[PDB]
Assembly symmetry: D2
Homo-oligomer: 445 residues x 4
């Protein structure tokens, strides 16, 4: 009672206990009840969390996700578990099995995508496997043999179909594809989404998380579900989405993640003697999306802007996505120093009221800030992990260390919360969130 | 490859991952394949290993075991999982559901018992729960309310039915009840077991562990299975076993564990205001079995002897069971110093060829020693844990620390082996043995 | 900023750095400025803290202390550093070199004693040395050869000269001898000390600790210095002190430490083949002082009382010394359970306002409690260490572990404070106190 | 006995204990007896090791070194301790106090230089200080105010006086200036050093390290001492050395360290608002020396070569200095991949007989390899630390982590050896070497 925190070994043990408890067999749910299916960028982080425990099972997680990849290369953001209820929109609402020519056979999936963090998970699996000896290296190398082509098709689909004009930024047709559902980034684009006759429905998410301050509103869900109707009406056809979708944004954070993932996968390709044409393409996309991210940036602070394709307007908001260029590099030296000063100062990690020195999803000084409300304020362990790993890859060893130290202190309550209140540290969202346990497992070493 | 060992956090994580992987829902198998059911003293150690992870689930493990308790108080040594094959002798061979008047309804179990380590697990659960706050203490205290009477009936059955002459030692009717199946302790008693017409059978254990040097022989299994026929013939009736069983031994290690468990449970009873008559009975049995253990001891070395009830002979062997009096106390000061010198010297932990400073199941200098063969030599993590915990309770803080340190070094390969070769450290028996993971989880803290 | 605490490795490093920094060469000061000499109790703890760093230097610390032993066996509580001032009363005020027939040659010392924790340090040195191999064992064994007789003379002087009536309690002639200078324990005895013509003096301690709330009062110092005058008047003659001293108390905490120390030293004597007559005397004294401690205890609560020899009155106070019997054993079962309830309850470790679950030097509910004032309330790491070590020796592994855990949490600020405010955790007294660093070093392992 | 290794907390404690024990007051000796003075490179590492213990004392170490800076900016490689003998060549042999116009007043020093690792120490001090709060930041900032000009003069002297032709490489006039005294790197240049009438001398180093296999030969010492005679003949005059010195080499490893140090110091200059002209000069030198290092490299393997200025010949050897470009960056992508293959392959860290996955000072497959002989083969913790820190700065987090992990495993014997035998792990050179303790302290965090 005097201190409810766990020791590092207790916390590592509890994190692994959680991850195995969320394992259905060949896929791990993103949470026990709120997200009782496989999500795409959660599955990448689950593979990272499993890599210290079982390289074999980490590989199985990515194999299961890639078995659900669409014919055109798209990795969908949900792979539904057989016979599992409690989540809306479920398979019947997406109707991809009926409508989508490119949907997989004998997997049920959603019809939209999510960020390409998967190459980062492959790198972590390979790094663990190389420390474990010959039969474990064999498992990881066989996975590359089996799935290199699928990973290439995934990156190629993003580069060719969501960057049709070769601008070096990824277009999204749903805010859910950003992974930051209700981020202030998307409010002005969502204001221009006007539902027609929306088939009636009842939410499931707020039966599980009943505190309305922690989840998006009914009005937001109506817009989320209407965008599904627009996609269904064109049978999820990539060629038709630009003509019909009421939501078309370039997501600069997704773009920077893609730049990093292309560079990571290219290095893997060189190391494991994959086809040279693939490696060349990966390095070309890495630089294209780095340049595309940098082109969005504020001339004074270096902050990255999203772009509303329909309104033809830069989207200026004060969220963690502004720090996209720190992930992929490319800023002039002087502007990157400015951007780091913004990150470390009183609008973000240096805000005086924060319990931990961590990055809030929205700046506490922004008028959009809401300290409990999903992506409008709370501190997300998954983002702490991504920033710390990317910062270490920039060579910023001490910055990465500080994020990991603060992230472990926050996570030491053992709640493995989805997100945390930035001022009080109260755990929010789902407890026992898989990618929060995965962050801890990767950090503790 | 240069060092295949895991860090403490990696090892804690892997141990917890294992324990959750062996969880069928409400019972944890003793191993994945070799022991694919609940065993009684493994279940106690599983509860100890779960206590740092989930006090609720640790309590469930003991509830499941106690739901299989026999009408007369006996906790049987196996609770079979529904529909699970691969282990022999299974429920059909025991026939307790058909034959045994005292067997439980709607659980399938074996018809023999195992050591009463369960009170130790209850103590560890209570100690964890008191560090975790009010609702967790409530869970552990509700378990006491629900199961105190069952635990008393278990201890009472041992004291009244397996110590009918109030000698302060527990009589066994099968070597499997000692937990040390093929220990040299039992060879001379087993030589006086002569099977009649033994119904034919085929072993399952050595389909999984195929190296014949690691498991008991066919001849030993024939005697193990014949004792079952003798029990079935009298329908497992406690009153008839002395008249018919070809194997009747007083087990001094089981007796010392019972002395400790009675003292532990009595202290729990005082702390949680259980009935005074129960606490009195528990302290009386604690002293009775302490005295019964001491009465067996060698006048020079203090080593404890088992007793063959049929032959009316002391059984003098050089195994770890000799150190029974160190667990429960009671030796005169000079003889306990002698016994510690035997433990620490070249016949046991001080043997010059041992890889780790740990207690071999049989002395390496004994003619009975076999370095691979189950209880005839190998080092068992479960015994390391029991000795270390009991030594700490004696006040021997440094001795307990040394066993824990050496036990963690041995376990750092992450195999969670059932037992280890004493000279090479090669993992033997089943890998991913639940009570080895539980030892590690309890130690690492 | 966000977390001013140190990691275990940083804290262990800083603790060792401190201890080496307070080393004058062959003696370690108790603190850098407040206590710029060798104190007897502190030197034993310093040796414990040095044992994980250098067995050789740990031995040197005890050799230096024992080289200052008086001719009659008394270990004096201060061994002054050559040429060092800044402490009062210094050697000119004691005048033991000119007056005390039993004072050592070529060392300046005080003329009173302090608790015999030294045997505990010898045990910790031996335990470390046995893990370090042959050459290091040889160092520790040579120390035993060289100093066993001096240790016997120390224990024999306490037993024969400070327990002249064989009551099994140690008589003190100065509250400084208790180690707890201004403890409420001694108030009613000090109330009967009426100074005569007291040679003038200026305090030095409160030039260093200037906050008057943290140190004894001027009136208290006048009594401390008056007792020195009474001892000087009879030339520190043991046979004359009972006739002249205005302060004569039996210290039950000192008595319990002596019981423990005799038992510890007797076990060392058996293990290292010291003379049987010495070992027998040590076991006799251990039992005599265990019994003397038990004789002081309240028959309901077990709380131990001091005794005012002049007033022939039990001293009933609410301080940590009440728990003396927990250190040495001997209480009836029911009485010890009651005393443990008192320790863990709302008058001591369970008090709801304490920052840490640690033992305050005076109960916060006592009218005598002062949260800043030396031994009248603050939490002392040296006592946390002594209780935790003695509790582990009793077999109370979890109680010992909780004290160590809370003590490390309190110490993680790296101040190595002499004592801490019980509610706020503010560091008080001298910073960089050697026995606080020593406790941390021994704990972290 | 069974495991002579220390735990992380024990090792950190012992490392700090060592560093304080080698402290003379305001300077730390490089080792207790072999190197009983302040060395320049070692003093930077000592400051790194002191930074987690005391930012104030870490600053003092660099202040003492910089107080011995020559008038022209040169930091000499030895600052002698007052009155200390036991080292040769001592100050009487150098005669810099009488001959060297640029030598400092009130400090005795050598007359040659050593690598500019000092900026790296300043960065580590600042990083620690920023985690410690206001008063500690003020200490580190006051040091920057006081010493920024001296650090600039040090870098400017290297850039202008040891790179007179603006080739981006540092010229050495003594192999002692490289830090790698008997490296195979310098053999062909030393072969052209023919001593004249050399004033007689007796070595002191091999009175302390008596094993001749671990130290340079007598013939090598004659060349080392002859070079001193040549420098003394021209009164250590910078402008005259090119005309007279028989040894003139461009040291690519020293050059790469200088590039890194300039970049590090430039970033500090920006963060702490130092003059823009200084920051610009630092970035210019960082690029100049990065380019000079790259110009030495094999166009297939990336391996860096030294250059013999007198012979006008690239020096092709198989030592750890070949990996200079990995420290500073600048290689084309394909060439750096080749150089990393060389580092990780069977000629260096991948050699199958190495006990640890660490960088030997000379390749074990080189005909020059000698496994015991100083820089001709052994593994040096100081280099492990420098490579791991520079690798982390490159963004190679896992490579840096593997070096730290293996370095800690090697160091866990607690010898703090100067270097280790690459196959057996035997500690060699001086024990209690300060920069080995410093590496351990920085690593353990």
């Amino acid at each position: 009672p005097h201190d409810p925190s766990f020791t590092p070994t207790q916390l590592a043990a509890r994190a692994a206990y959680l991850l195995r408890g969320n394992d259905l067999g060949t896929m791990t749910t993103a949470a026990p009840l709120l997200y009782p299916h496989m999500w795409s960028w959660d599955a990448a982080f689950v593979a990272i969390g499993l890599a210290p425990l079982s390289v074999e099972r980490a590989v199985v997680e990515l194999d299961t996700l890639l078995s659900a990849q669409w014919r055109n290369g798209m990795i969908p953001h949900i792979v539904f578990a057989n016979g599992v209820d409690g989540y809306f929109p479920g398979p019947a609402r997406w109707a991809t099995a009926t409508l989508a020519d490119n949907a997989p056979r004998n997997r049920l999936t959603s019809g939209i995508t999510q960020p390409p963090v998967h190459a980062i998970a492959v790198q972590r699996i390979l790094e663990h496997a190389r420390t474990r000896g010959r039969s474990t290296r064999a498992v990881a190398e066989a996975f590359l043999d089996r799935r290199w082509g699928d990973l290439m098709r995934w990156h190629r689909w993003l580069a060719e179909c969501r960057d049709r004009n070769e601008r070096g930024r990824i277009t999204l047709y749903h805010g859910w594809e950003s992974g930051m559902d209700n981020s202030p980034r998307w409010d002005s684009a969502y204001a221009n989404v006007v539902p027609g006759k929306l088939p009636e429905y009842q939410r499931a998410d707020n039966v599980i998380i009943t505190d309305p301050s922690q989840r998006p509103s009914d009005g937001e869900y109506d817009r989320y579900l209407w965008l599904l109707e627009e996609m269904k009406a064109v049978r999820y056809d990539d060629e038709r989405l630009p003509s019909v979708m009421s939501f078309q944004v370039e997501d600069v954070f997704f773009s920077a993640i893609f730049s990093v993932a292309c560079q990571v996968l290219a290095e893997i390709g060189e190391d494991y003697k994959r086809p040279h044409a693939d490696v060349k393409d990966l390095y070309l996309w890495a630089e294209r999306f780095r340049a595309g991210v940098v082109e969005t940036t504020d001339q004074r602070t270096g902050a990255a802007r999203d772009f509303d394709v329909l309104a033809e307007k830069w989207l200026v908001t004060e969220t963690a996505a502004q720090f996209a260029p720190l992930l992929c590099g490319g800023l002039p030296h002087d502007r990157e120093r400015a951007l780091l000063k913004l990150l470390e100062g009183p609008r973000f990690c240096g805000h005086p009221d924060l319990k931990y020195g961590l990055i809030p999803s929205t700046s506490p000084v922004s008028r959009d800030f809401r300290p409990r409300e999903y992506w409008r304020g709370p501190v997300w362990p998954v983002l702490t992990w991504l920033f710390s790993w990317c910062f270490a890859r920039r060579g910023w060893a001490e910055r990465a260390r500080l994020l990991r130290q603060e992230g472990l202190r926050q996570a030491s309550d053992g709640s493995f919360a989805e997100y945390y209140e930035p001022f009080t540290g109260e755990p929010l969202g789902s407890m026992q969130q898989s990618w929060t346990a995965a962050a801890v497992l990767d950090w503790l070493g």
